[PDB]
Structures are given as C-alpha cells and as structure tokens.
Design an enzyme around this catalytic site. Structure first.
Site, mmCIF file in Angstrom:
data_model
loop_
_atom_site.group_PDB
_atom_site.id
_atom_site.type_symbol
_atom_site.label_atom_id
_atom_site.label_comp_id
_atom_site.label_asym_id
_atom_site.label_seq_id
_atom_site.Cartn_x
_atom_site.Cartn_y
_atom_site.Cartn_z
ATOM 1 C CG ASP A 291 -7.876 -0.748 -4.332
ATOM 2 O OD1 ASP A 291 -6.669 -0.393 -4.370
ATOM 3 O OD2 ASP A 291 -8.494 -0.892 -3.272
ATOM 4 C CG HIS B 63 -2.071 -1.034 1.027
ATOM 5 N ND1 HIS B 63 -2.032 -2.261 1.654
ATOM 6 C CD2 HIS B 63 -3.214 -1.019 0.299
ATOM 7 C CE1 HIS B 63 -3.124 -2.942 1.349
ATOM 8 N NE2 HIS B 63 -3.853 -2.215 0.522
HETATM 9 C C1 LIG Z 1 -6.985 -7.242 -1.274
HETATM 10 C C2 LIG Z 1 -6.252 -8.039 -2.366
HETATM 11 C C3 LIG Z 1 -5.994 -7.409 -3.637
HETATM 12 C C4 LIG Z 1 -5.345 -8.110 -4.654
HETATM 13 CL CL1 LIG Z 1 -5.087 -7.285 -6.161
HETATM 14 C C5 LIG Z 1 -4.917 -9.497 -4.461
HETATM 15 C C6 LIG Z 1 -4.180 -10.339 -5.538
HETATM 16 N N1 LIG Z 1 -5.163 -10.131 -3.160
HETATM 17 N N2 LIG Z 1 -4.855 -11.385 -2.730
HETATM 18 C C7 LIG Z 1 -5.316 -11.474 -1.458
HETATM 19 C C8 LIG Z 1 -5.221 -12.698 -0.544
HETATM 20 C C9 LIG Z 1 -6.169 -13.760 -1.166
HETATM 21 C C10 LIG Z 1 -6.178 -14.921 -0.208
HETATM 22 N N3 LIG Z 1 -5.121 -15.628 0.141
HETATM 23 C C11 LIG Z 1 -5.540 -16.544 1.035
HETATM 24 N N4 LIG Z 1 -4.715 -17.563 1.709
HETATM 25 C C12 LIG Z 1 -5.065 -18.608 2.612
HETATM 26 C C13 LIG Z 1 -3.771 -19.273 2.953
HETATM 27 C C14 LIG Z 1 -2.847 -18.948 1.862
HETATM 28 C C15 LIG Z 1 -3.431 -17.746 1.180
HETATM 29 N N5 LIG Z 1 -6.812 -16.403 1.216
HETATM 30 N N6 LIG Z 1 -7.236 -15.388 0.431
HETATM 31 C C16 LIG Z 1 -8.608 -14.892 0.333
HETATM 32 N N7 LIG Z 1 -5.900 -10.315 -1.146
HETATM 33 C C17 LIG Z 1 -5.818 -9.459 -2.193
HETATM 34 MG MG LIG Z 2 -7.215 0.811 0.745
HETATM 35 ZN ZN LIG Z 3 -5.671 0.413 -2.606
#
Ligand SMILES: Cc1cc(Cl)c(C)n2nc(CCc3nc(N4CCCC4)nn3C)nc12
Ligand SMILES: [Mg+2]
Ligand SMILES: [Zn+2]
Length: 313
Positions: free
Chosen positions: A217, A68
């Site tokens: 975003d 961020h």
């Molecule tokens: C806010 C955001 C924005 C963007 Cl552009 C991306 C590419 N991401 N990826 C994520 C994490 C996704 C995720 N990983 C996992 N785990 C469980 C155990 C191993 C990983 N669970 N989840 C839901 N968040 C985001």
């Molecule tokens: Mg934000």
């Molecule tokens: Zn953002």
C-alpha cells in the site's frame, strides 16, 4: 485455453522488479493485472471471462480522485505480485489467489477522504462501521461485486475454501487501515526477535499478510525518485482537499492536510519515512529476506527527501 498473456519486452522484464511503474496507459492495466495472476497463480486459477468481467466492474467502482484511484489499486497489486514471486514457496494456493484480488479491491469506492473526516462529517458509513470505516466499506464492495452475475471468480472453490479466501481478503483489506499498522508491526517485531514467530500459527500468518498489505500500500515510496515525487503531489492533492473540507466544518485540519503548510512537505515526508515507511520495510525484510529491495529503495527515497530539504533539489 492455450491463450497466454504476454507483454512487450521492457514490461515483461521490468514487471518482475519491485520498482516497476505500471505506466500512463490505463487500457494496459487490466492486461498487466491478468499477466500477474497468470504467472503468480496459474492460467487455471480463474475463468478468464469471469476474471475480466470482475476486473472491469472493480475498475468501474474506483473513483476519479487524485490518489486513491484505479492506478493505485493496480500498483498495490503489482507490489504484492513481486513479493509473492520472490517468496515462491511460502504461500498457500489460496493466499496466492486471494492476495492479488485483495490488493486490487483494497480501496474500492474510496472518496478521497480519511476515516477521520467521515467521522467528523458524520457520514452514514461512520455509523455503520465505527472503526476502519473505509476499509470495511472496501471489503463490503468487494463482496458485492463478487456477487454480481458472472463475477464469481472463486466459483470453482469449495464452500470452505471460498469462506477461507474471503476471510484472507477481509483481513488483508482491514490491515490497510494504517491506524492498525503500528501495533501490528510491533507485535511482529517482538515475535521475530524472541524467535516465537511461527508461520504455522494462523494468527501469525495473518499479521505477516497484514504487514505485506501495508508494504504494498505504501509502495509509492519504493519507486524511482521521479515516480515517488510525482505520486506525492497526488497524495497531497487529496489530503489538502480534505483539509479544505475540515475548515468548512469549522475545524483546523492536522498539518498534513493543510495546504498552508506546503513548505513543510519535505519535512513531513521525512517524519513519514522515519515513523512509518522504513520501520515497515525493515520488519518486512527481517521476516521475508527477498523483499530487501523495497527497504533499499525506501532508504534511497528518504535520502532524496533529505536532499530536497538541503536545497540540493
Ligand atoms: C498514507 C501515505 C502513503 C504514502 Cl505512500 C506517502 C508518501 N504518504 N505521505 C503522507 C503525508 C506525510 C506527512 N506529511 C506531513 N506534513 C506536515 C506539513 C507538510 C507535510 N506530515 N506527514 C506525516 N502520507 C502518506
Ligand atoms: Mg485505503
Ligand atoms: Zn491504498
């Protein structure tokens, strides 16, 4: 007065594409942003001196966290620029002005922690803003910076236009609270399907802008695969540090934030593209057909994560 911003040829051409990466040269990002305002809004939108001073103060109020950060701000603005340039006629002069600014400012002064961690740590900001905690803080920071001497890029606007632009910015920034996205995309889904969706209903425009903000975003998932993959490392570097902090407070973090679950990353990305990313670009493509390349890129990257799971990389 007769001063254009121009970029080298490869940038000049590739910046028009959705999957553009702004590159590793931090000192070119302000120029890139100004280039985008000039083509997207006009060379007459903002007083150059004021704009540059605004850009630099915004930059200075982003922090050196893995994800961020200032690079994220400029990236999210570039995605918005591509949307705006591919939907020329659908947006007011004020929206064009406000939206790139909103994107640049949307994560101002982020600390690398989720709203949830602030609430559990009991940070002063959580007392001041009980919901969308960071996002109300981001808007607040935007207003502060706008009020610095010589920083009023909206000075030529009327009193009511000024109020309208700050209001576009506010809603846009709030909409980046992913917790709000689901309900927002659902309403939009339904309104498009029952044919009630009406771009002249102001509350409908709001929802659409909100969906755009989510799309911009999340645009890391719409880049070329090596960019997508490398950003993912930065994303987890933050989440896992937050995970550590949860543990320090005596709390099991959710799996997303727990570095002990490194191995499940490919599968967590899968859920994320399916639960969040694909639906977002889908509904966005329905509402705004020329943004389909975002959906197409998102699907390519999901397929790359599938390939990672199958040991093919
Ligand atoms: C806010 C955001 C924005 C963007 Cl552009 C991306 C590419 N991401 N990826 C994520 C994490 C996704 C995720 N990983 C996992 N785990 C469980 C155990 C191993 C990983 N669970 N989840 C839901 N968040 C985001
Ligand atoms: Mg934000
Ligand atoms: Zn953002």
């Amino acid at each position: 007065g007769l001063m254009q911003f121009t970029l080298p040829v490869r940038l000049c051409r590739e910046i028009e594409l959705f999957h553009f990466d702004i590159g590793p040269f931090e000192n070119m990002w302000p120029g890139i942003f100004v280039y985008m305002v000039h083509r997207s809004c006009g060379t007459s939108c903002f007083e150059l001196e004021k704009l540059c001073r605004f850009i630099m103060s915004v930059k200075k109020n982003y922090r050196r966290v893995p994800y961020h950060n200032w690079k994220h701000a400029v990236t999210v603005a570039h995605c918005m620029y591509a949307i705006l340039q591919n939907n020329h006629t659908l947006f007011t002069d004020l929206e064009r002005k406000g939206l790139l600014i909103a994107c640049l400012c949307h994560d101002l002064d982020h600390r690398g922690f989720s709203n949830s961690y602030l609430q559990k740590f009991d940070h002063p900001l959580a007392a001041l803003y009980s919901t969308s905690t960071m996002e109300q803080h981001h808007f607040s920071q935007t207003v502060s910076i706008l009020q610095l001497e010589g920083h009023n890029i909206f000075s030529t606007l009327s009193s009511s236009e000024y109020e309208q632009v700050l209001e576009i910015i506010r809603k846009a920034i709030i909409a980046t609270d992913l917790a709000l996205y689901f309900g927002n995309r659902k309403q939009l889904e339904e309104m498009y399907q029952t044919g009630s969706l009406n771009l002249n209903n102001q509350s409908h425009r709001d929802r659409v802008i909100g969906l755009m903000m989510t799309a911009c975003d999340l645009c890391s998932v719409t880049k070329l695969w090596p960019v997508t993959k490398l950003t993912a490392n930065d994303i987890y570097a933050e989440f896992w540090a937050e995970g550590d902090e949860m543990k320090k407070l005596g709390i099991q973090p959710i799996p997303m934030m727990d570095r002990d679950k490194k191995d499940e990353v490919p599968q967590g990305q899968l859920g994320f593209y399916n639960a969040v990313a694909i639906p977002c670009y889908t509904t966005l493509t329905q509402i705004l057909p020329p943004t389909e390349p975002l959906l197409k890129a998102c699907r390519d990257n999901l397929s790359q994560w599938e390939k990672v799971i199958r040991g093919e990389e």
